[model samples]
Structure formats: C-alpha cells, structure tokens
Target: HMEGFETSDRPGVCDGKYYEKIDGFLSDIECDVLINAAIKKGLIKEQTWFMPGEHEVIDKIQKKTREFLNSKKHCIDKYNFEDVQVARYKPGQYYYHHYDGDDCDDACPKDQRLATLMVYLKAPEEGGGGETDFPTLKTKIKPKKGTSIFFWVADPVTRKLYKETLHAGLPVKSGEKIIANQWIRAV
Candidate 1:
C-alpha cells in the first residue's frame, strides 16, 4: 500500500512472462506535479529534457518506496542503485534494447543497479504500440495511468549478470508515452 493507498499489499510481480500493473501508485495531484514538472522542464515531445524533474521524482519515489518495501520485506532494505533517466516517446518515438548500471566510471558508485522500476504515466491511443518488452522476463507492460512496473535487471545470487535483460521501447503510436525510470543499484 502507498501511504494509505487502497490496494492489496501483494500486487503481484510479473512472472517474467506478462507485465504486472501496480495501481494506485500516484494520487491525481501528485501525478500532475510529477508530469507537469516534467513538461515544464522541457521533457515533453519536442524538448524532452531528462535532468530537471527526474531527480526530484526519483528522490521522492525512492524515499516512499524504501519505506513501503521495507515494511513489506520485514524491515529489510532491499534496494540500492542509481542512473535515473526520464524518457519520453512521442508518437512514433522508440528506444532500442540496452542495459544500464553495467558500465562504471572511476567515479561510478560501487552499488550497481540490480533492478529497474518504470512508471507509466499515460496510456496511448487504441492502436498505440509503445510497449515495454522484457525478453528475459517474457513480460510486456502497456502504458497506463497511475500504474508502475518493476523487474530485476540482474541476478541477485550468482551475480552473473545476464546480458539479455536488454529491453526495448516499441514505437509510440497515437499518443505520447512518458516513463520515469530509475535503476536500483546494489550497495
């Protein structure tokens, strides 16, 4: 549950097969603040700024999700990662398969990104195709308002990173697809 959110505690995780949707992720006003800030920061179709509001939302979501996950994981801290990015796919926009948190600079944090959390702000039109497809997980998430999806990007035990977690963003069809993505690093 998200700060008194009226939803089940165990919003099912995608079994690496189908995209799981977590509803009640954001209140209407919060959504406005998040999306509008992105728009004002020029992160929309034409400008697509990825720096400004992305950090703000990351900080907020990290804090909130930390608390929520801790409670659910029995007070365990299960997340540590970085490399936050804001990506917007306007009609016909798309992204190819790729991975983050693998490449580390001398200044890069030791805690690599082990997981990825993506929040889809708005759904596309009837024929939109900008879906997020995770081949390893065999899951595909469609854009929907107030919905969020999470998936492991790395193996937690073997630590043998899989190169195929590589995913792609299908071309946006009739509407714009905006996503807030943050990599969960290992500390």
Candidate 2:
C-alpha cells in the first residue's frame, strides 16, 4: 500500500521531500495575535533587489512559532531558529522570484538559512489572489488562514544552496494577505 507520504531526510529528495503543508499550524487565536502584533510593530515597505514587500519582525510570535516547529518529527534539531518575519501583502503587492539561501556571495554569515517555515495568519477572501510559487518545483500554494508551508533552501548534508528552491510571492489582487515566516539556520 502506498502511504502517499514522502520522507525528507534522504539526499536529493529533500528539495521535494521537505516540502510540507500543515493545516492548523496555528490556532485562530494564535493567528489573530500574530497579525495584531505585526500591525502594532508597523510593517515597512522596501524595494530591495532580493525582496520587495511590507514586513515586520515580531519576537513574541517567534518564540512560540519556533517551539511548535521544533515539536515536529523532521528536520528541527539539525538547525536553529534564526529569525521571524511577518509580511503583509496588500492589493498589487508581490515579491519577485528569489532564493533564500544565505551564501558567501551575498556576504552572509556562515550559518546560512537552511529551511523556511511560513504560516498564513490571514488569507484573502475567496477569489482574492495571494499565492506562493516555487517556479522550479512548479508548485503554487494558495494562502489559507492558520496553515503553514515548509521547505528547505539548502541540502542538509552539504549545506549548499539548492537552486531548485527558487520561489516567489504572487500579488494579492483584491483582499489582504498576512503571513509569518520563520527561518532556521544550520546548527
């Protein structure tokens, strides 16, 4: 019998293997709290080459989000939580395709971003656009409240950036979209 589930520990398989979707990763109250916190912190808009959007870091949500992620069975102990970012995507807001890997080319730290764990705190109304796309994988995720999507940008063994990890955030056509991203670095 095919269980229809894949494991993420295997080499070469993690690019597709580690990609997972967890419904209810955050409860309604948790999502509400996170969204409110982001607003209180005040999101900043930027047009950086890598990313262009309104974002804020909420430390309170980071602690809890990290704990919940660590509780999972796969790919937690191998890395340490480095940062958390809450992003808002209003109408016509979107980010271009890019890689999240922190490599020497960018003068990033030795401990590069190994994986990404993003939760949708608020979703746009039905028919409202706000989807995350992995161009290499040909995967597109529609935002859903309290749901989360996880994927790694580097190989656990080599700790090298996986070109297959290229992804982008699509514009929100009408309604608002809010999400929280937690990045883990090689330990």
Candidate 3:
C-alpha cells in the first residue's frame, strides 16, 4: 500500500495522487529563525500568502529551500520557482478545502504552478487538530518540525489539474502552527 509519503528514497518516481513527506528537511535552528521572523514581523490574515522576501534571513532560507526541493524531484529542473510564503496559523485558524492546481485562481495562465512544497516550522504537540487533510485520499498528515509535504498540482506535460490534489488545513485546536510554502512552476 502506498502511504501518503514517497516510498522511494528518491523523489523522481513518486506518485502524484498523494503528498510525499520528507522529514528533517530543515533544522531546529532554521525553524526557530523562521518562527522568530514571523513573530517579529507579525502575521497577516490573508487567503493564500505570507511575507515573502521581507527579511535577508528569509530570502536566504527560501533560496536554499528551493534548491533543496529541486534536488528531490528529477523533473524539478524543468520548472521555475516561486517566492516562499511563511504562513502561520494560530489557535482557531484554519484553511478550508482548496486545490493547488491549474484550476485554482493562482494558476490560470500557462506556465503556472506545477507543484507545492511546504515545510513545517512548528506543530502543536499532542492532539492539536492541525493536520493537512486530503479528503479524496482519506488521509491526514500531522505537522512535524522540519518535515516537508510535497504534492503536484498539475501535470508537467499537459498542465492539467489533478482533482486528487484537493486538500485542507484543519483548524489548530491548541497552540500555533507555522509553515513555509514554496511553489514550483513551469518555465
């Protein structure tokens, strides 16, 4: 059975039906740095965004993060990278069901986003109710520090949206949830 994560050690041949989780993709210090940056800058209430290229630290982090993400998937080289968004979800906050594919508002034109790579900076301990849920897949992934969740939003060749990419960020029952998103697009 293929779990939500990539069974293969490499990222080239992973299935697109579900997200692939990569643990320890970031470091504790890196996470703290990002969390602190968000804290200092203050998070905004937005539909799909965060402070991008706001600080030097964040810029460097995002650059390196994209590089790391590109290395994982063999097909990454054929795509372009988007700015990283440092997202924060406090108690009672949640993102409703949505898709990250070409059908979405963000990817209307050609050469749009092909995949989504999210890194967890902080996760509530115990039962926080802040899991990334995929209703279509009937699975949910709890947040973990330094872990990454990657899912393809559209087919690389045809640029077609995959309905299986529908997902939601559940409300945080307790504590706060911090994450960073790096979207990859076709060149």
Candidate 4:
C-alpha cells in the first residue's frame, strides 16, 4: 500500500501476529552503500553502535520507515529511539535469543518499544546457514539482500512487550551476514 516497498503474506509461524517480509524494501545499490559504510566505519565488532545521521542513508531510512509504519498502526515518536545497530555476523558468530522490548510492570511503565526493522545488507551464499530464527514461532528466515524484515514486538494498544518476539541470529557456516537493525520507541 506504499511506495518503495511491498510486503509478503504473513509468515505461517507468526500465525496471527505481525511477522512479515517487506520485499524490495531497498535497492541493491543502496544495500551496497550501507554495507560499505559499515566496512569503512570498521564495524569489526559483531555489532556496531549506530547513531542517527551516522550516514544520510540511516536518516532517510528512518524517515521513510516512520511514514510507512504510521500508514498501518500507531507508533509513538517523541523523538524516541533506541540506538540502532549494524550487526556483522562472521562465520561461527551468532546472537543469543532475546527480546528487544521489556515487559510492562503495572506499578510503573518502562521503555515502550513497539517494533523492530531489520534490513539485510548482505547474506551468505545459499545453504550457508546464517538464518535468523524465532524459536517460539517455529520459523527461520534466510537473509536476502535488499529485503527487510518487520515484526511487532509489543502490543500497539497495551504497549506490553510480546514474549513471542524473542529471536536470534544463527551461527554462520560460511561467508558473512550483515544487517541494519532499527528500533521504534514509544515515548
């Protein structure tokens, strides 16, 4: 329903939840630009702390994303955002399963993270095994450059984190996997 991207049918694993692929989200050239940018920055560590305006691409992506998201559900934006991350998973490196948002305590509110946007800048060759896995959802996704994944991690109305959103990057068997990770915050 928007330009610059189109979505896939909801993945079966997500069932009623929002876990889908945004195909053609970015062009091949743009993916290269982002990967190269991370390389130049020496994102040698598994994860590179990304800051707004770190590159024009990041800013543009964020702007476009905010617009794209507002088209569907309510997402707060009081200039609130967690530090973005550019993750580089080399052979044998993988992230442990974790939640991007915290559960709300009735006594007090906590950081309100609604969703995550992960853009695949690069993926290992076919059969290389760097897929991202959602154990709870019983699903796994292979990275395809120029495509991005979007998943809701919290209730849009209640603002409570969804435990089902727990996911992790599987160890890479060959080549390297790179991703641009962004978080939407409700402040």
Candidate 5:
C-alpha cells in the first residue's frame, strides 16, 4: 500500500500479501498533527516507538491501529508492542528494499510478519519522488502526509510467498519526510 520509487531501482527481496489503492485509512487532522509534533521535537530516526512516554496519546494510537488491523480480519501475534518508530529522511537519506523480519531471528516476534501499516506523517513536495514501492505488485505508492498505507506481507492460505515484495525508499531530493510503521502477524 506504500507508493512507488524509481522503477530503476531493483526489486531485490520477496514477501507476500500485497494490496493497493486503499481508501480512507487515516484522518487528515491526525496526520498533520503528528507531523507537527515530530518537526517541533526535531526527532529524526528510523526506529520503532510503540507507546510514547506520554500515555494518552500512545493509548489512542494503539487502540486505533489495533482496531484497523482487527477490522481487516488479520490476526495479531503479539500485542505487547512497545516499539513504534518514526523515520526521518533528510535530503539525501534513503532506505533500500529489505525484508522486515528474518526467517528465524529471535529479535522479531514469533508469528511471522503478515502485514505492514506504513503511515505518512510528512509527504515530500510533488516531484521529490520518495516512494515506497512493492515491486511484486508492480505497485508504486506515493506519500500523502496524514494518510496511511496498508499492505499484507504474506498469505496464510496459498502458502506461497511473495519474494519480490522487497521495497525501498528512492533517494530523497528535497525537504524532509517521516513515516510511522508497524509489523503485524497472524495469530
């Protein structure tokens, strides 16, 4: 559900569960507000921060994100998420295509990642071309700050994996961009 970067980039990895063109996944006010907070705090890092030190705000995000995942009929492997990270991309910073969890890493949860919710906090100006592309789906999603992009990474039914889902953030050109992401698993 994330957007596309340069097709010139390689589809270097694979996973499963891909969907695109989602509608109504986030609220406009919420998007803008979060971006403002991040900007104000001058926070810039690619790491997960599940519950903020602040309780109420963190609680709201948790409830909303879980509600959305549940409504989508996906399973939650471990609800004890404490790391909700925000990514910061300066003018030349970029993330290359890579899988979220390793096959047998103790660092990741047990159920295996089933889906990803990548929310855009601040979108780059048009033509900046900082996209999150799912190569397997031939899908390239552009950023819409305040909007979230949802997609599955694997399927339980077919048992076949999406090997080309490896995604990347093409080099950023101007301004800054931030995103919030979550990894979901099947119960």
Candidate 6:
C-alpha cells in the first residue's frame, strides 16, 4: 500500500488508480543533464547506462525518488535493485503493453519491484502520439519536459503483480521522445 499517501494527497492521481503524474519531478536542468549524459555515451536507446557505473546524474534522480517516497528499493545492501535506463523513441517506435517485473517473492515481498518511475527528458508536440498509455486504467499520459510519473506494478494490498497495471509506450508520430526509467520497490 501507499502507506503514507492517499489519492487526495498525491497530485494527478484519480481515485483507485495506482499511478500519478508528478509535475516538475525533475528540473529542466536535470532533464537536460540526463539527455546529454546518455547521448555522450552513445546510449540513445541501447541498454548501456544501466550496465554498471557511477553515474552521478542518474543517481541524483534515484536519490530524489528515495527521498520522495522513503522507499526501500533504493536503499543499500540490496540485490535485484535495478538501475536507471535511458531510451529514446523516434517516429514509428513504441513499446507494447507489459508488466515491469516478476511476481513478488516471499523474501522481499514489500521490497520487491513495486513500481516504476518514468521521467520525460524530451517530449514531442501535441499532435505527437508519444504517450504513456494504460489501456485498462484508461489513462494516457502526454510527455512533457521535466515531468515524471510513478506507477505501481502490483497490488499494493496483496503484494501480487497487477495485470491491470500493464502499460505501453504509444508510437511516436513525430520528433524525438526521450525518457529515463527507474524501478522502485516501496516497503
């Protein structure tokens, strides 16, 4: 459960939705840092940034999330904690609906992958179709610079993976769509 949070307390969350859009979750400068950092390493859409390295820019974002939710997912002495991912979608690119992780195990039930945070590094124009979509939830998120969203992948009460939370990255119609991803487990 979102122990300390409620629907009314979190911005952009409609009742019963296991997600919320956090505007200005990242500053414009912070967004730029991530974009530039990824490009410099030739990691536009490849899975390189999450490989293994001391990426200060990425860590800053993760730290902010940890501070925001007081989450155990970003804490130390952790295994299976994922790293930040940088992906850019051009026109014609999109992701299919999918779950974010394996089912919760006994050992790390509360601390298993609980949610995902996606920060928009770059957003296309209004006519663009590059949106984060939740078909079952009937929510379509338009990408905006410096904006981010946190979404649960499991039943907060039961700690079981929620197929209801399955989501997709709608195809980008024009321009570039860039985003940073971070997995989180709330305890």
In candidate 6, what are the lDDT values of residues 1-187, reduced to their tens digit? 4346656432222245577788988888888877887888787635445544567668777877766555432322232347788888888653688888666546436556767878998898778888898887777899999898987775444556766678888999878788989886545
lDDT per residue as tens, model 5, 114-157: 65677776778868878777775677888876667766555433
Tell me the whole-model lDDT of each prediction, alpha carbons only: 0.59, 0.69, 0.73, 0.75, 0.59, 0.72
Residues 43-136, model 3: lDDT tens digits: 6543134456566645665676677666657545577767677787877663689877557444455776788888888897687889998887
Top model number, TM-score = 4
Off by over 4 Å in 6: 1-17, 50-53, 71-80, 103-112, 156-159, 185-187
Q: Sorted by lDDT, highest first, which candidate order results?
A: 4, 3, 6, 2, 1, 5
Across 1-187, the per-residue lDDT of candidate 2 in tens digits comes to: 1246765553563423647888987787878876765566666452111122233224544555567556653543566775467777888664799988854443445578877888898898888877888877777899988888888777655677776678888888878888888777876
TM-score against truth, every candidate:
0.69, 0.74, 0.76, 0.81, 0.69, 0.75
Worst 10 residues of 3 by lDDT: 8-17
Q: Give per-residue lDDT, candidate 2, residue 30.
A: 76
Better of 1 and 3 by TM-score: 3
TM-score of 5: 0.69
TM-score, predicted candidate 4 vs. hidden true structure: 0.81
Give a tens-digit lDDT track for model 4, residues 1-187. 2345867553222246467788778888888887788778888756676688788677766876777676664344342566667878887553699887876646324557778988898998767888889887678988998888988787655677677778998988888888988897766
